[PDB]
Amino acid sequence: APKAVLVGLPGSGKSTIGRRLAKALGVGLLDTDVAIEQRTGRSIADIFATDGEQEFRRIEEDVVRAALADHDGVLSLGGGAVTSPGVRAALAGHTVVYLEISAAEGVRRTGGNTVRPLLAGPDRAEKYRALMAKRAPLYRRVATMRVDTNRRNPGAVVRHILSRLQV
């Protein structure tokens, strides 16, 4: 089973910490969004557009269940996977690290290299706040380790995790 399963909002660092954590442990890294596209030949948006959300979620939940059973490294979960009660069930008993972030930091990390984000309009940040409202309670539910990534370097987040995942 995975050494760690990482969950969190956009910006929390699933990609970044997933990579560094896999490197530090010397283990493989599996991202469930990439796994879905590699298993289907279709891009995530395309499955959504063509088959819709329930069908994407069904597929995602099989990819997730398969990785939990088969992968021994770090597993990074798609942001919406935890919306599926079947995914929340399958996670139980696993090491699930929830990468915490605030809406403020969240928006900043997903806001690009533009120096003035407010000029674009408030809509993206409002959608981000709403997303956090929906998702954060679910991440808290499935977590076995909660890690606050607000004003921590990726290096510091990785250390924190590694010190709490010795064998």
Ligand X SMILES: Nc1ncnc2c1ncn2[C@@H]1O[C@H](COP(=O)(O)OP(=O)(O)O)[C@@H](O)[C@H]1O
- By beta-carbon proximity to ligand X, the closer residue of 2 and 11 is 11
Among 16, 83, 102, 144, binds ligand X (CB under 6 A): 16
Centroid of chain to Cα 106: 13
CB of 145 to Cl ion, least distance (A): 16
- Residue 151 DSSP code: T
- With CB under 6 A as the contact rule, the residue among 2, 13, 73, 106 that binds ligand X is 13
56: exposed, middle or buried (Cβ count in 10 Å: 0-12, 13-18, 19+) = buried
Pick from ligand X, Cl ion, none: which does 8 bind, CB < 5 to 8 A by kind? ligand X
d(CA 10, CA 106): 7
Return d(Cα 108, Cα 167) in angstroms, integer: 36
Q: Which does 155 bind (CB under 5 to 8 A by kind): ligand X, Cl ion, none?
A: Cl ion
- Going residue by residue from 19 to 58, which x/- string records binding to ligand X, judged by CB under 6 A? ----------------------------------------
CA angle 112, 116, 119 (to 5 degrees): 110
As given in the structure block, the two tokens for residue 81 are 């996977």
| Residue 117 partner contact from Cl ion, ligand X, none using kind-dependent CB cut-offs of 5 to 8 Å | none
Nearer residue to Cl ion within complex by CB, 16 or 110: 16
Contact 37, 44 (CB under 8 A): yes
Q: Does 158 bind Cl ion (CB under 5 A)?
A: yes
Helix (H) or strand (E) holding 15: helix 14-25
Q: Which of 109, 129, 159, 160 binds ligand X (CB under 6 A)?
A: 109
